[PDB]
Amino acid sequence: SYDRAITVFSPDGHLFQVEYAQEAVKKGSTAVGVRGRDIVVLGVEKKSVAKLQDERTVRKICALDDNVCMAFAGLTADARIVINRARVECQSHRLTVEDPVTVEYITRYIASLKQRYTQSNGRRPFGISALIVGFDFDGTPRLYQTDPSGTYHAWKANAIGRGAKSVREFLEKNYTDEAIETDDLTIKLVIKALLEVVQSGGKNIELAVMRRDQSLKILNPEEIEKYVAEIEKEKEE
Amino acid sequence: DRGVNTFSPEGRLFQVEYAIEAIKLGSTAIGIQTSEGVCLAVEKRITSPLMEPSSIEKIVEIDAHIGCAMSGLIADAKTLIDKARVETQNHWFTYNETMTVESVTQAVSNLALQFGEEDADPGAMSRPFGVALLFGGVDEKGPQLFHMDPSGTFVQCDARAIGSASEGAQSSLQEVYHKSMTLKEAIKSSLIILKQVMEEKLNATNIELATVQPGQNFHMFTKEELEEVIKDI
Amino acid sequence: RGYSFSLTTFSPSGKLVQIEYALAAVAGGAPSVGIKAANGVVLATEKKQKSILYDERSVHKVEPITKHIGLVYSGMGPDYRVLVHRARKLAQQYYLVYQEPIPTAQLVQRVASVMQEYTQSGGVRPFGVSLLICGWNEGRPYLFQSDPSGAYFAWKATAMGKNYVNGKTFLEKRYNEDLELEDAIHTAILTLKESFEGQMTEDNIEVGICNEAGFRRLTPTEVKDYLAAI
Amino acid sequence: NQYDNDVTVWSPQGRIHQIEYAMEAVKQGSATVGLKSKTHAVLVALKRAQSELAAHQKKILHVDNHIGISIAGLTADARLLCNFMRQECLDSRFVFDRPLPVSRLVSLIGSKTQIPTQRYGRRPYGVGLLIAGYDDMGPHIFQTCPSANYFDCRAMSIGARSQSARTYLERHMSEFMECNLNELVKHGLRALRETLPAEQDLTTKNVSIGIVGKDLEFTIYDDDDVSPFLEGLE
Amino acid sequence: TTIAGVVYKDGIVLGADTRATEGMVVADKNCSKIHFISPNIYCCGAGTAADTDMTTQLISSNLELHSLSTGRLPRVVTANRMLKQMLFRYQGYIGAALVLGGVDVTGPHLYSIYPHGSTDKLPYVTMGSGSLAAMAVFEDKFRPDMEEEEAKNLVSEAIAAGIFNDLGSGSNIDLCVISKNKLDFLRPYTVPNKKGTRLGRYRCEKGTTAVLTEKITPLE
Amino acid sequence: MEYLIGIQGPDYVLVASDRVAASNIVQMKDDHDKMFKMSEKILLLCVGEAGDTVQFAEYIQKNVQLYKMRNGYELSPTAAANFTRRNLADCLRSRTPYHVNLLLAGYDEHEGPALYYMDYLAALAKAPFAAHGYGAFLTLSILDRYYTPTISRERAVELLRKCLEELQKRFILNLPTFSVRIIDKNGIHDLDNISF
Amino acid sequence: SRRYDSRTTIFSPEGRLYQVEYAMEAIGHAGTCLGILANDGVLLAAERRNIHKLLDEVFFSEKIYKLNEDMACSVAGITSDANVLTNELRLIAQRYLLQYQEPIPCEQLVTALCDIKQAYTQFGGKRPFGVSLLYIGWDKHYGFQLYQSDPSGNYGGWKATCIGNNSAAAVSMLKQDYKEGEMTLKSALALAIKVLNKTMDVSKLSAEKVEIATLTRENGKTVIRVLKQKEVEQLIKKHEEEEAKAER
Amino acid sequence: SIMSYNGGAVMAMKGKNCVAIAADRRFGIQAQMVTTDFQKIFPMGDRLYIGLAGLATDVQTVAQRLKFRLNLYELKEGRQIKPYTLMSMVANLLYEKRFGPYYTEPVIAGLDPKTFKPFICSLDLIGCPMVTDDFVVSGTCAEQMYGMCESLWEPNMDPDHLFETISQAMLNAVDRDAVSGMGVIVHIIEKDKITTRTLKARMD
Numbered sequence A: 001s002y003d004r005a006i007t008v009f010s011p012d013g014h015l016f017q018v019e020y021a022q023e024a025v026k027k028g029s030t031a032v033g034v035r036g037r038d039i040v041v042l043g044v045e046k047k048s049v050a051k052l053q054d055e056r057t058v059r060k061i062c063a064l065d066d067n068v069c070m071a072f073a074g075l076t077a078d079a080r081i082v083i084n085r086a087r088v089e090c091q092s093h094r095l096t097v098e099d100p101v102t103v104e105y106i107t108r109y110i111a112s113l114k115q116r117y118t119q120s121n122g123r124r125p126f127g128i129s130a131l132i133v134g135f136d137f138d139g140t141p142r143l144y145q146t147d148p149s150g151t152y153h154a155w156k157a158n159a160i161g162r163g164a165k166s167v168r169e170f171l172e173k174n175y176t177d178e179a180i181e182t183d184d185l186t187i188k189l190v191i192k193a194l195l196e197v198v199q200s201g202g203k204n205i206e207l208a209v210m211r212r213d214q215s216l217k218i219l220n221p222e223e224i225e226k227y228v229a230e231i232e233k234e235k236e237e
Numbered sequence B: 001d002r003g004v005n006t007f008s009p010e011g012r013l014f015q016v017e018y019a020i021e022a023i024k025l026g027s028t029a030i031g032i033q034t035s036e037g038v039c040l041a042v043e044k045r046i047t048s049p050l051m052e053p054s055s056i057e058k059i060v061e062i063d064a065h066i067g068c069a070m071s072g073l074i075a076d077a078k079t080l081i082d083k084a085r086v087e088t089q090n091h092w093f094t095y096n097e098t099m100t101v102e103s104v105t106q107a108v109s110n111l112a113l114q115f116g117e118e119d120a121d122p123g124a125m126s127r128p129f130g131v132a133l134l135f136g137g138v139d140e141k142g143p144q145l146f147h148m149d150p151s152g153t154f155v156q157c158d159a160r161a162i163g164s165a166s167e168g169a170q171s172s173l174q175e176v177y178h179k180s181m182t183l184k185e186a187i188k189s190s191l192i193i194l195k196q197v198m199e200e201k202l203n204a205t206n207i208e209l210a211t212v213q214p215g216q217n218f219h220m221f222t223k224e225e226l227e228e229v230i231k232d233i
Numbered sequence C: 001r002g003y004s005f006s007l008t009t010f011s012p013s014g015k016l017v018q019i020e021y022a023l024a025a026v027a028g029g030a031p032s033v034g035i036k037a038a039n040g041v042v043l044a045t046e047k048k049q050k051s052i053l054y055d056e057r058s059v060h061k062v063e064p065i066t067k068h069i070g071l072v073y074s075g076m077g078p079d080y081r082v083l084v085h086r087a088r089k090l091a092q093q094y095y096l097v098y099q100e101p102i103p104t105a106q107l108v109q110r111v112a113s114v115m116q117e118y119t120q121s122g123g124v125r126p127f128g129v130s131l132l133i134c135g136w137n138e139g140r141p142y143l144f145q146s147d148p149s150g151a152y153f154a155w156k157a158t159a160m161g162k163n164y165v166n167g168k169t170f171l172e173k174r175y176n177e178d179l180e181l182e183d184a185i186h187t188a189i190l191t192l193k194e195s196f197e198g199q200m201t202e203d204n205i206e207v208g209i210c211n212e213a214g215f216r217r218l219t220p221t222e223v224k225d226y227l228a229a230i
Numbered sequence D: 001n002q003y004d005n006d007v008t009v010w011s012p013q014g015r016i017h018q019i020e021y022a023m024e025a026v027k028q029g030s031a032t033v034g035l036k037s038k039t040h041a042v043l044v045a046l047k048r049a050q051s052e053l054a055a056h057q058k059k060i061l062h063v064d065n066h067i068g069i070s071i072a073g074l075t076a077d078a079r080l081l082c083n084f085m086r087q088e089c090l091d092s093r094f095v096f097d098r099p100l101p102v103s104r105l106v107s108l109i110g111s112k113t114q115i116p117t118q119r120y121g122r123r124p125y126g127v128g129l130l131i132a133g134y135d136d137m138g139p140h141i142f143q144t145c146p147s148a149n150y151f152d153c154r155a156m157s158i159g160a161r162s163q164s165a166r167t168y169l170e171r172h173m174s175e176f177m178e179c180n181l182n183e184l185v186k187h188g189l190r191a192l193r194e195t196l197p198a199e200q201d202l203t204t205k206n207v208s209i210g211i212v213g214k215d216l217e218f219t220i221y222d223d224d225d226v227s228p229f230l231e232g233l234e
Numbered sequence E: 001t002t003i004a005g006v007v008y009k010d011g012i013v014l015g016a017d018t019r020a021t022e023g024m025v026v027a028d029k030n031c032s033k034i035h036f037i038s039p040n041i042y043c044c045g046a047g048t049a050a051d052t053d054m055t056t057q058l059i060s061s062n063l064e065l066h067s068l069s070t071g072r073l074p075r076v077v078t079a080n081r082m083l084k085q086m087l088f089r090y091q092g093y094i095g096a097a098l099v100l101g102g103v104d105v106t107g108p109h110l111y112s113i114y115p116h117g118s119t120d121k122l123p124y125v126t127m128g129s130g131s132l133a134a135m136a137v138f139e140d141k142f143r144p145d146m147e148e149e150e151a152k153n154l155v156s157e158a159i160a161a162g163i164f165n166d167l168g169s170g171s172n173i174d175l176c177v178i179s180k181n182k183l184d185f186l187r188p189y190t191v192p193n194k195k196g197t198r199l200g201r202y203r204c205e206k207g208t209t210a211v212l213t214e215k216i217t218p219l220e
Numbered sequence F: 001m002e003y004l005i006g007i008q009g010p011d012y013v014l015v016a017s018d019r020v021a022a023s024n025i026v027q028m029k030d031d032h033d034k035m036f037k038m039s040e041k042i043l044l045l046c047v048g049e050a051g052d053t054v055q056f057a058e059y060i061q062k063n064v065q066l067y068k069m070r071n072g073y074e075l076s077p078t079a080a081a082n083f084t085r086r087n088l089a090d091c092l093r094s095r096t097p098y099h100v101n102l103l104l105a106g107y108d109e110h111e112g113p114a115l116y117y118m119d120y121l122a123a124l125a126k127a128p129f130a131a132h133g134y135g136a137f138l139t140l141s142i143l144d145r146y147y148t149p150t151i152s153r154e155r156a157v158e159l160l161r162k163c164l165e166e167l168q169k170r171f172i173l174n175l176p177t178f179s180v181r182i183i184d185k186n187g188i189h190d191l192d193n194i195s196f
Numbered sequence G: 001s002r003r004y005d006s007r008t009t010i011f012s013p014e015g016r017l018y019q020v021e022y023a024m025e026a027i028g029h030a031g032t033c034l035g036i037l038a039n040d041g042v043l044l045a046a047e048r049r050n051i052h053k054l055l056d057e058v059f060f061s062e063k064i065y066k067l068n069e070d071m072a073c074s075v076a077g078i079t080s081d082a083n084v085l086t087n088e089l090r091l092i093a094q095r096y097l098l099q100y101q102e103p104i105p106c107e108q109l110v111t112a113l114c115d116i117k118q119a120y121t122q123f124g125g126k127r128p129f130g131v132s133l134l135y136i137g138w139d140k141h142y143g144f145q146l147y148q149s150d151p152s153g154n155y156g157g158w159k160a161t162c163i164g165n166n167s168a169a170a171v172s173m174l175k176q177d178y179k180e181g182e183m184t185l186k187s188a189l190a191l192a193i194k195v196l197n198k199t200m201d202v203s204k205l206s207a208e209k210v211e212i213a214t215l216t217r218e219n220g221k222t223v224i225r226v227l228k229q230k231e232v233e234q235l236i237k238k239h240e241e242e243e244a245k246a247e248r
Numbered sequence H: 001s002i003m004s005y006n007g008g009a010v011m012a013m014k015g016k017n018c019v020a021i022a023a024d025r026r027f028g029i030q031a032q033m034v035t036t037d038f039q040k041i042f043p044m045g046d047r048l049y050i051g052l053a054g055l056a057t058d059v060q061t062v063a064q065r066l067k068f069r070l071n072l073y074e075l076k077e078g079r080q081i082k083p084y085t086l087m088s089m090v091a092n093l094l095y096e097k098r099f100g101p102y103y104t105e106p107v108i109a110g111l112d113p114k115t116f117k118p119f120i121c122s123l124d125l126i127g128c129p130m131v132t133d134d135f136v137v138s139g140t141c142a143e144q145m146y147g148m149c150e151s152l153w154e155p156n157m158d159p160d161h162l163f164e165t166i167s168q169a170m171l172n173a174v175d176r177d178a179v180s181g182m183g184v185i186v187h188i189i190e191k192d193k194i195t196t197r198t199l200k201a202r203m204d
C-alpha cells in the first residue's frame, strides 16, 4: 500500500495541495445558494451546453437524502465520490438515530471527510467545494458551505466556483427581507445572481428548489425561461 | 523535498516549525485564569455579512468543567477536540470522577508528533496539526488554563494569547494581569485587548466568550450578555 | 517493503516511455520467426551463441507450455523464464477447473494480462520480451505475439528481434495461405538466414512445431536435415 | 547536503547528519544536572518559562519508586520515552516482583532508540535524558542521547551552557561520594547556576529537584518545596 | 471398491472394479477408478469419490509442471511425497485411499497411500471395502518376478474376489499395465457381470401420458 | 407468536400481521407493527428471532432507500426480493446468520402486484397468497378453499377476516388485533386494524 | 523511496492532474471511435489499427467488446489497459445480476467503472489507465443509450460522440448532420461512414479499415452484432454513390 | 436429513439425438406444501439445462452462482460452453465448499453446441461427476426413480418415446414419495427446438 505523505506543510504554514485543490474549485462552474424564509434554492452555471449531450446525465445538483441536497463546484469525479459517501452516511444516521440527518450533521460529516483527505498518507485532497441545503426537523431552512480544507460555515446566501467573488458581492447588496419575502423572488434572486456571470444568458442555468417537507424539485428550461423574462422585462422600468 | 520526519541543523522538525507558523494565520484568542474561574475570548473574523456568525465556533465545551479555545487551521482542530471529549468520558466511565484539565491537555498532546510515512497504518497522519489550543477549566486544583501547540508541548499559563496578534496581546496581558484579579476584571481586560488587536470594530456578534467557575459549569455568553459587558468597553 | 508507486508513467506527449524502452530491448534481441501454415505452426530462433564451450542442449529458447502450446521470444532471456513459468501455471489452473486444455487464445490473454501488470504495478519495470505463442485447438493452428505492454496480436507470419522490419517484408513476399508445414519450416529458416551472420548449424538455431499431434521441439538431427537444402 | 536529510544515509566521512542534528535539540534545551554520592542520586533542572505569566515547563518525571528522569529536547519525545521506561518497570515488577535494575532499563532504552536510526523514513529521538536511580548496586546517574548511546556517570549536565556545569562538576567530583544529601544537592544547584547569565539567579520559580536513595523513593521538589535547598547557598 | 496392484518382472499391474455406491445403492455401474498421474505413473482410488478425483488431478497437474521444468520423466517417489504431504496436512479429512504405481529411471515402484498420510512401499497392495478378499488372492498366489500375463491374471483374480464377496464392489474389472516400453490401459479388461434381459415390453405410445401444457421454442 | 399473511389480486396486494410482542407468558405490547416500508410500493413483513428481525429488515430497508438515492428511481419488488434473498443466503453459513421469516409485497408499474415468500434458509417463492407462523397451519387451507386470481379487494378483506376469525376460534394463542395494509398503483394504504 | 516516486496522484499548482491530462494526449492519438444513438438502436464504428497484410483474424472484432446481454463498448487508447477495464466491466455486470437477478442499468455500469478510474487519480501512487470508452446499451429505465468515459473517471451520456484521432472534427460533422429525435439505424450508419470518411484523412476508406457494431431490440431481446465486411463495403458504396449526387 | 427438508426429484434421460430433463414442482417445508410451481431446472445455454434437487435455498444459490460463472466464461471465450465443460465448472464450484457443502445434487442434460451429440450427467453434493449413456436421477425418491428407469429405458429412443418414458418414470416414482410431486415439468431438447410440457399429475 502507498503511504507517501502528500499533503505537507511548507515554509510559512502553507498546505500547497489544499491551496491547489482550491484552485481546482475556482475553475469549476459557478454555483449559488440562497436560504429563503421557507424555501431554499440552488442554481448552477452551464457547463458546456452542447446539443448532442443528454442533459440528465451531467446535473451538478444532487439529492443526498429526502430533506438534504447539494451542489458543488470543482472536479466532478471527486464530487461523485463525496456525494455517494454522504448518501451512505445519511442512511446510517436514519438507521441508528431514527431521524433524518440535520443539514449541519451531514455537512459536518462531509467536511471531516475532506479534512481527513488533507492529513492522510497516500491521498490527495478532494478538489471540490459544496453548497448543502435543506430543512431541520423543526422546519428551519439551512445553507452550508464546505471547502477542500474541511472548513465549513452556514450562510444566508453564497456562491462558489468561477466568478464567486462578484456573485458574492451582488448577493451582499441584494439579499434583504424584501428579496426573500416570497418563493418566486427568492428564486429570481438566484437567477439574477447567476445571470451576472453566466456567459450566453441563460439558457444554461440549472436550477432546483426545496420546500419545507416537500422534497427536491428541479426546474425545466420552460419553467426557467418564465422567470428569466419575468425579471428581464422588470429591469426596463 | 525531504521526509516529514527530517530534523533541521538546529535540531527542530521542519514540519512542526512550519505548523507553528500556520498558527499565526489564525484569529486571536485569549485565556485568563483567576481564583474565581477562567475566561476564554476569541475573535470570530467574519469575512462576509452573508455568513452566519453563530456558525463560527472557536470556543467549544470539552466537558461541563472544561472549555477549549482554538486558533490556526480550524478544520485540523476537530479530531483533537473529539479526542479530548472521548478521553474525559472514558475517564468518567472508568474512574467515576472528572478528569483534570492538565490530564486532558496531556492526552491530547500525545497525538502531536504521531505523523510519518513508513511506521504506521495504511493511511495514518501525514503531517502535524496546524492548531494551537487553550484549555480552560476547574478541577480540585481550582481554576486552570493550559496552552498547547503543534510540538505537543503544553504548559499552565496565568494568561495567554494565541493566533495573529498574540504578540501585542501577550504584552497587554503582562500589563493588566494580577494574581488577585477578579473574573469580571479578567473578562473586561480580554475584551479591551481583543478590541485593540482586531481589524474590525468589536461588537456582540464578531467575538465569542466563555467562562468556567468553581460554582458553575462551562458557559458560553449569549448575545445579550456580551452586549452588557461591551457597554463599558 | 517494496516501492508502491508506478515506475512506468505518462510523458507529456502521452507516451509510456518505459514500455517503448522495453521494446528497444526486444528489438536488440536475437531474431525469432513464426509462420502459420495450413496444417500447423513453426517457431524458429537464432541462438546468440558464441562459444563452442556452450552446451547448446542445456537451456532452450523454444519451450512447451502444454501438450498443444509452445512459445519462443526475442529480448531478455531471464524475463522470458518468468513468463514461461507463469504461462505453464495459468494453463494448469485452467485445466483443473475446466478439464479441457486451455485454448491458445485464452492462454495468450492471461499471459498478456500479467505483462500489463508490470507496466502499472508498484516498484517494477516492464518485461523486456515479446513472445510468439503457437497452438492447435478446434482443429486449427494459431500464432500469436504478446508485447511488453500486454498488447497481443494474431499473425499469419511474423518476425521479431534484430532486423525484424526486413524479416516481415521477406515473409510478406513469400508466405501463402495454402502453404504446408514442411515448406513453412524451410521459409522460417530462410528468414533467419537473411539476418544470420555466422554459418548456420543445428546447434545455433532452435525450431519448434505445432500441429494436430501437439507441440514439440525439433531435434538436432531433424534441424540438420532441413539445413542441408539451406 | 545530499547526505543530511535521511537517517539511513551515511556521509562520505562516516557520519549520519540526521543523528547529529537530533543532538542539537538537546543542546538547545534548558540545562539539567545529575550527580550522586554513596547513598543518593540527585537531579536538578532549570525550567524555562515562555512568558512572565507561564508556569515553567516540567523537566523532571517519575518513572518508578526507584527511578526518575530529567529531560532536554523535544518534550513529546521525552514523554514517549518516559512512557516506555514506565512500562518496562511495571513489567519487571509484575513478572519478578522486584525493581528493574537501572542499568538494564538503560540498555532497553539504547536498544529501543537505536532502531529508528537505521530505517528509512524514521528519525532519531530528539531528547537526551539524565536518569537517577537506586538499586542493589547503589545510586546511579546515566545519560542517554539521540544517537542511542548511553553513559554511566559520576555526574553530568546536558542542555544549553551545560559546559559550565560540567566544568564545576569536574572541579568538585572528588567530594561527591562522601557528601550528605544537603551538601550533594547544593553542589547540583551550584553547577546549574554556572549555566545562567550573570544577572540572573536560582529561584523557587525556575528550579526543580529530584532525589532518590537508600531510604528515599524518587521524589520531585518544585515551587515552595525547593526553598529549603536554596536557602543556605552561603 | 476393490483396488489392487502388483510389481511383476518388468513393471506394474494395477486393477480396479467399477462400482460406485451411495449408501447401499449403486450410483455408477462403470466408474473409472484408475487415474492418470503422468505418462509413466497411474493411481487407483478408493474412499470418497470427489476426494480421490480431485487429489489425483491436483498432483498430476503439479507433476506436469514439475516435468515441464525438469525436462525429465517424473519419479514415482515424487508423486508419493506430494500425495502423502498433502493428505497429512489435511489430517485424514480428505478421504483418499490410493494405490500408486509406475515405472521411472529406477524401475517399477508400488505404494499404498492412506488418508491420514502414511504410505507403504510393497510388491503387492490392496485397498477398498474389497481389499481383504483381494489380499487373500495375493497372499495365496503372488510370486516374485511374474511374467506380464501371469501378473494380469493374478490382479484380475484379486479384483474378482472383491467383486463377488464385497457388496461395495462390482461390475467390471479394469487393469493398467505399465512397463519401460508400454502402457496398456485396459478399460474394461473383463465384464463378469451383465444385466439380465427384459422379458416384457413397456413401449408406451404417444398420448399415454396426459399433458396439461405445451410450449415449443424453435432454435437456430 | 407471530402471524403474517398476504393475498395478491389482479392489481393490488393485501397484507396483514398480528400486533403482539410477547415474552414468556405475557403480551408486552398489543400495538406492535411487523411491516417495514422499503419504498413507495414495497412492504417487507418480518418475523423470527428477537434482534435478528429488526436488524435484518432495517438493513434491507436502508439499502433499498440507498439504491433510490444513488440512482434516481426505485428497485422493483422482484429485484428487492432477490436482493433480500442474496443477503440472507450469504449470511446463512457465516458467523452472523439471521433467523427470520419474511413476506415481501409490492407493486411494479410494468409487472403489477407481487407477493414473495421467504424462509430463514433463504428459499424464495413467488405466490398468489402465503402466510407464516403457526397460524398459517390453520389459515392456508381457508385461502386454498376461497381464493381466486381475480378476487376483488373487498373480498380479499373478507377472506382475510375469515382467516383471522379462524385464529380466534381455533388457535391456542391470544392474537386479538392485526395491522392491515394494501399496495397498488397509488402506493401503500393503511386500512383499519381488524380487532376482536 | 521518495527520490524515485514520480507522484502520479498529486495536484499541480493550477489544480491540475498531470497524469490524467497526459493520458488524454495518448487517447487523442489512438484509432478514431464514434457512437451514434437512433430511435431503433445504437451503433459503434471504429478505425482499425490492426491492418498489416500478415495479421490473422481470429476474433469477431478488434476494439468492440460485449459487456453483458444488453451492452457493448469500444475503446480508444492503451489496448492492454482496455483489456483490464473491460474485464472489470463484465465482473461488475455479473455481480449486479447475481445480487438483483436483473441486468445492470447502463449508467450504473459506467459509474461503477468510473469510480475505479477516479480512485487511481486520487490515491495509490499508480499511473492512471490510458483509456477512453464509448458504451452502448438498452435498459428498461431509459431504453437505448450511449455513454462516454475518460481517464479522469468522468462520464457523460450522448446522442452522438467521438473519441480518439480527429475527435474535434468528427464532433463538428455530427453537430451539423445529426437530427435529434429523427435518426434511424440506417441513417446513423450512413452518417458514421460520412464522418469516418472525412476523419480518416490518411487516406482512402475501406472495409478492412473499419469495424461497425449495432445494438437493437428484437422480440423482447437485445441483439448485438458486428457487421460483416460485405455489409460495410455496401455502406461505403452507398456513401460514394450519394456524394455523386452532391452538386447536380 | 437436510436433503429431505424440502423434498424434490429431478431426472435426465438420453435418446437418439435428443435429451430429456424432468422435475417435480413442489416447494414445501417438511410436511407443508408452500407452492406448486417452484423452478428446479435452469437454462445454461440454448441446448443445455441443469436440474437441481436438494435444499431449496442451495438449488437457487447454485443455479445463480453457476450462471455468474458461465456468463463470464462465455464472454471471455469465443463461445457457448460444451456439456462436459459445464459439468467440470459445476464440480469445481461444489468442491470449493468440500468442508461446508451446498446441499444439492445436480443433473445436467444437453446437446453439444457444435456437434449436437447428447450428454447427461449428475454430480454429488461435493462435486464428484458421473457421466452415463442412459439416465441419471437425483432427489428424495432416487430408489423409486431407479426402479422405473431400469425397467423402462431403452437405447436410441426418438423424441416422442423419450418423452413418454421419462414422464412415466417421473410420475410413478414421485407417487411413491410423500415429499415429491405436486406436478411434473419435462423439457425435451432437440437440435432444432425445445419442447416444454407440464403433466397431468396427482396433487396429494
Ligand SMILES: *[C@@](O)([C@H](CC(C)C)NC(=O)[C@H](CO)NC(=O)CCCCC(C)C)[C@@](C)(O)CO
Residues within 6 Å of the ligand: E001, E002, E019, E020, E021, E022, E023, E027, E028, E031, E033, E045, E046, E047, E048, E049, E050, E052, E128, E129, E130, E167, E168, E169, H122, H123, H124, H128, H129, H130
Ligand atoms: C469405493 O471406495 C468407491 C470409490 C470411488 C472413487 C468410486 N467409493 C464410493 O463409491 C463412495 C463410497 O462412499 N461413494 C461416494 O463417494 C459418493 C459419490 C458416489 C456417486 C458418484 C457421483 C461417483 C467403494 C468400495 O466404497 C464403492 O462401494
Ligand SMILES: [Cl-]
Residues within 6 Å of the ligand: A113, A116
Ligand atoms: Cl475516510
Ligand SMILES: [Cl-]
Residues within 6 Å of the ligand: A025, A026, A129, A159, A160, A161, A162, A164
Ligand atoms: Cl470558490
Ligand SMILES: [Cl-]
Residues within 6 Å of the ligand: B023, B024, B132, B161, B162, B163, B164, B166
Ligand atoms: Cl500563537
Ligand SMILES: [Cl-]
Residues within 6 Å of the ligand: A002, A003, A004, C002, C003, C004, C005, G001
Ligand atoms: Cl513506496
Ligand SMILES: [Cl-]
Residues within 6 Å of the ligand: C084, C085, C088, E068, E069
Ligand atoms: Cl517453468
Ligand SMILES: [Cl-]
Residues within 6 Å of the ligand: C066, C067, C091, C092, C095, C100, C101, C102
Ligand atoms: Cl493442459
Ligand SMILES: [Cl-]
Residues within 6 Å of the ligand: C064, C215, C216, C217
Ligand atoms: Cl519438446
Ligand SMILES: [Cl-]
Residues within 6 Å of the ligand: D028, D029, D030, D071, D072, D073
Ligand atoms: Cl528542554
Ligand SMILES: [Cl-]
Residues within 6 Å of the ligand: B151, B153, D073, D074, D075, D076
Ligand atoms: Cl519541543
Ligand SMILES: [Cl-]
Residues within 6 Å of the ligand: D145, D147, D149
Ligand atoms: Cl553520542
Ligand SMILES: [Cl-]
Residues within 6 Å of the ligand: D026, D027, D157, D158, D159, D160, D162
Ligand atoms: Cl548538551
Ligand SMILES: [Cl-]
Residues within 6 Å of the ligand: E077, E080, E081
Ligand atoms: Cl516418500
Ligand SMILES: [Cl-]
Residues within 6 Å of the ligand: G068, G069, G070, G097, H071
Ligand atoms: Cl449477461
Ligand SMILES: [Cl-]
Residues within 6 Å of the ligand: G068, G069, G070, G093, G097, G102, G103, G104
Ligand atoms: Cl446481464
Ligand SMILES: [Cl-]
Residues within 6 Å of the ligand: H065, H066, H068
Ligand atoms: Cl460463486
